[PDB]
Design a protein around this ligand. Structure first.
Ligand SMILES: *Cc1c(COP(=O)(O)O)cnc(C)c1O
Ligand SMILES: *Cc1c(COP(=O)(O)O)cnc(C)c1O
Ligand SMILES: O=C(O)CCC(=O)C(=O)O
Ligand SMILES: O=C(O)CCC(=O)C(=O)O
Ligand SMILES: O=C(O)CCC(=O)C(=O)O
Ligand SMILES: O=C(O)CCC(=O)C(=O)O
Lengths: 404, 404
C-alpha cells in the first residue's frame, strides 16, 4: 500500500476479513493442467445461447428504454409477475407471498444477514452448508448451531434436540438456513417428512426458515420434492431462487419470496446497498421465463449433466478403496465424499494436486470447521473422460495417503 | 404481515430503516400528469442504442461464454484494463492505483461504509450532498460533519476550521466524501485551488477522500477540471466512476480506483455481498470503452442536455421573483434553488404539486436535515417546452407562498 499501515483506516469487520489460502490455491489450479473436481460453476454448454441471442434482439426492438433505464429497488414488475406465476403453477407456492429481485442469491443472503441479525443472534445451518452463506452471514457476527446431514438431508431430530437444549439455557434461534435439495456441497435432499417437521419446529420455537434452492430444476433421477415454501402455511419461509444454473450466472439475477412485511424491509435495505438489480438482465430473465424458454430448456440442462453425474458415480464405485463413502445425489452439481478417518482432506490436497487432481476440502463448509475427512467433488464443469481419470487419480491419492 | 409482529425478528438497524414520505409522494408524481423537475434519471434519448445493439451481437458471436459465466469478484480483466487506460490518458490518473468493478457506485458507497466505518467514526460530507451516499453510510452509524458549498464547491476553509476544532476535542475524521464536479444535488464544481487544499488537509489530518464522479463527461460549458484523484500523490483518494449517465444505468456497472491495499479489502468485502458484478454488463461496458464508442458518444450526450440546462436557466431568470437564487452548473443534471428564506420548500411542495409542478425539497440532502429553503431541479428528463412551463409554475408557486 502507498499509505503504509493502511489498516489504520479499516473497520473492526474489515480487519477480520481475509483471503482463504485454499480458495487462492484453487484459483491457481483452475488455470493450470490439473484435472479439477473443485469447481462450483455450471458448464457454458448448458447456457441457452440461441435463445439468449433471440431475446437480446427482442429487447432492443421492443423493450430498450425499460431494459436500459434505472429500475425500482423491488424489481422489474413483469419479471416479478412471471416468477410468482411460475412458482405458483410449478411448485404450489402461495400467491399471498411477496417477491423482490436480487443481484444473485448471494445478495439475498447478505440482505438476510442485514435485516435479521444482531451480533450474537443464533443461526442454524446444516453441517456441511454452503460456504458463501457462512461468508454473507459472518459480517453480522451470528453464533452458529450446526445440524448434521445424513442421506436424507438435515437430521431435523437433532435440531429438535438442540432447540430444547437452547431453550433450557433461555436462548432461541432466529433463522434456520437450509439448502434442502441437491445441497451444495453434500448433494443430498431433505425428505418430505423432515420438511414438515422443520416447519412444525419453526412454529413451536418461533424462527424463520431460509430455503435456498438454486438446483431444484437440475433433477436427473427420482421424483420432484415439495418445496419447503410450498408447505409454508404461516409465512415463515423465505424462498431464494436464482437464474445462475438455469439460465447463466452472468446476468446476476435471483429472487426472494416471502411474507410481505419481511420483503418490505428487504427492499429498504437493498435500496442503499445497490439501488437496483441490473434491469437489462431482469428483462432478459423475464423474456426467458414468460416466453416459455425456461420450461423448454430445463430438459436440455438435465440431459447434459445426468451422464456426468453417472460417470462420476461409476468411477467412484470402481476405483475407490474400502472405507470411502459418497453421496448419491438425484440432481445438482456435487458429490460429497467421506474418507475413512482420520485422513485430513485439507492436508491430502497437496498430494492430490501432485497426482494431477483437485477437489474442495470439506472443512470450510462447516460453520465450526470441525470435520476434516470430507471433500466436495463437482461433475458439471469437466468432462466424462476427465471425470473418470480424475476420480482414478483421487482414488490412488487416497490409497497412498492410507500408508505411513 | 402473516407473522403478526414481524418486527420481533428484525435487527437493530432494520428497525430504524424507514421509507421516506417525500420519496413515496414523488414516485406517485412521476407516474402522473404533473410536470416533474424532481427526477434523478438520465434521458433514454441519450442511451446509445445502436451501439448497444452492435455490441450485443458482437458479444454473442465472440465473447458469449465469458459474458455468461460467473466472473471474479474484482471484475472482468479487460474492462479493468481498458478503464485504467482511459482514466490515465483522459484524466491523468496514476497507473499505480488498483481498480475493482462495482455493481454501481451505490455499491461502492456501501462497501466504503463496510470497509472503513465503525459506529461513531466521523465522515465529512458537503452540505448539501448526495442523499444515497448518506443512505449507504447510515447503516454503519457514522457521525457527520457537514461543510457548506458556495458557487465554487466545498468551502475547504470551513473544513480546515472544523478539523482544528475536532483536533482540540481529541477527535479525527476518517473519510471526506465529495461530489466535486457538477454536484448532485447542487450543480457546482470545486475549484482547482480547493482540490489541492483538500489534499493538503488529507495529508495533515490523515484522512481518506472519496471522489464520486458520475458527471465529469456531461460538461456543457467551461473547461475540464482536474480530478482530485489526478492530484493525489499519496494514494489518499478513492475515485468512483459509473456507466449510469455515460452509457445507461440498466447495466449497473461502476468502478472504484485507489490504493491497492484498500482495493484488496474492498474485494474481500464485495465477495460476500454479491459475489461478482454482472459479467454480461461488464463485457458490454468493455466493448463500449475499448471500441472507442464511449469517446464518440460523449459529445452527443453533451449536445443533448446543454439546451435543456440552458432552457431551465433562461426560464428561472425570466420568471423567478426577487430574492430567489440558483446555481449555474457547467454540466451534470441539476440546478439548485434557494428561496428567500423563511420559505420551507418541503411545506411548499404541496402547493407546487397543486399548481402542476414537482421538485425535490433540499432538506433530505443535508446530513443534519437543517436547511429548509432549498430545492433540487432536474433538466435531463423533462423537455424544453415542459421545462419552461414547469419553471413558470414553480415561480408562481413561490410568489403565492411569499404572500404570508
Ligand atoms: C449456486 C449457489 C447459489 C448461487 O448464488 P447466486 O448469487 O445466485 O449466483 C446460491 N446458494 C447456493 C447454496 C448455491 O450452491
Ligand atoms: C448518479 C449518481 C450516482 C450513480 O450511482 P450508480 O449506483 O452508479 O448508478 C452516484 N453518485 C452520485 C453523486 C450520483 O449523482
Ligand atoms: O465462483 C464460485 O465458485 C461460486 C459460484 C457458486 O455459487 C457455486 O460455486 O456453486
Ligand atoms: O430451478 C432451479 O434449479 C432451482 C429452483 C429455482 O427457482 C432456482 O433456480 O433458484
Ligand atoms: O431514482 C433516482 O432518482 C436515484 C438514482 C440516481 O442515481 C439519481 O437520481 O441521480
Ligand atoms: O463519465 C462521467 O461523466 C464521469 C467520469 C466517470 O468516469 C464516470 O462516468 O463516472
Amino acid at each position: 500500500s502507498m499509505l503504509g499501515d493502511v489498516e489504520r483506516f479499516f473497520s473492526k469487520k474489515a480487519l477480520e476479513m481475509r483471503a482463504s489460502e485454499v480458495r487462492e490455491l484453487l484459483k491457481l489450479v483452475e488455470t493450470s493442467d490439473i484435472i479439477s473436481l473443485a469447481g462450483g460453476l455450471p458448464n457454458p454448454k448448458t447456457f441457452p445461447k440461441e435463445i439468449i441471442r433471440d431475446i437480446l434482439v427482442e429487447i432492443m426492438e421492443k423493450y430498450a428504454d425499460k431494459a436500459l433505464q434505472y429500475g425500482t429497488t423491488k424489481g422489474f414488475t413483469p419479471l416479478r409477475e412471471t416468477l410468482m406465476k411460475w412458482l405458483g403453477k410449478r411448485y404450489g407456492i402461495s400467491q399471498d407471498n411477496d417477491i423482490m429481485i436480487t443481484s444473485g442469491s448471494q445478495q439475498a443472503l447478505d440482505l438476510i444477514g442485514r435485516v435479521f441479525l444482531n451480533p450474537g443472534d443464533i443461526v442454524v445451518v446444516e453441517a456441511p452448508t454452503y460456504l458463501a452463506a457462512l461468508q454473507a452471514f459472518n459480517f453480522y457476527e451470528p453464533q452458529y448451531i450446526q445440524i448434521p446431514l445424513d442421506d436424507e438431508g438435515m437430521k431435523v431430530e437433532i435440531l429438535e434436540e438442540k432447540l430444547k437444549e437452547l431453550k433450557s439455557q433461555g436462548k432461541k434461534v432466529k433463522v434456520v438456513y437450509t439448502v434442502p435439495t441437491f445441497q451444495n456441497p453434500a448433494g443430498v435432499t431433505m425428505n418430505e417428512d423432515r420438511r414438515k417437521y422443520l416447519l412444525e419446529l419453526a412454529s413451536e420455537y418461533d424462527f424463520i426458515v431460509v430455503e435456498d434452492d438454486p438446483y431444484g430444476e437440475l433433477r436427473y433421477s427420482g421424483n420432484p420434492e415439495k418445496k419447503i415454501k410450498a408447505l409454508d402455511n404461516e409465512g415463515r419461509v423465505i424462498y431464494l431462487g436464482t437464474f445462475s444454473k438455469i439460465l447463466a450466472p452472468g446476468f446476476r439475477i435471483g429472487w426472494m419470496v416471502g411474507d410481505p412485511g419481511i420483503i418490505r424491509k428487504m427492499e429498504i435495505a437493498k435500496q442503499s446497498t445497490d439501488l437496483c438489480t441490473n434491469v437489462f438482465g431482469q428483462v432478459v430473465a423475464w423474456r426467458y421465463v414468460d416466453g416459455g424458454y425456461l420450461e423448454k430448456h430445463i430438459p436440455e440442462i438435465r440431459k447434459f449433466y445426468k451422464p456426468r453425474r453417472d460417470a462420476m458415480l461409476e468411477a467412484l464405485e470402481e476405483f475407490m478403496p474400502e472405507g470411502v463413502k459418497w453421496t448419491k445425489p438425484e440432481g445438482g452439481m456435487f458429490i460429497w465424499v467421506t474418507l475413512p478417518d482420520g485422513i485430513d482432506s485439507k492436508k491430502m490436497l497437496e498430494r492430490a494436486i501432485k497426482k494431477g487432481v483437485a477437489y474442495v476440502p470439506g472443512e470450510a463448509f462447516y460453520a465450526h470447521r470441525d470435520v476434516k475427512n470430507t471433500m466436495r467433488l463437482n461433475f458439471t464443469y469437466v468432462d466424462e473422460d476427465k471425470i473418470m481419470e480424475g476420480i482414478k487419480r483421487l482414488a490412488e491419492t487416497i490409497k497412498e495417503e492410507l500408508k505411513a
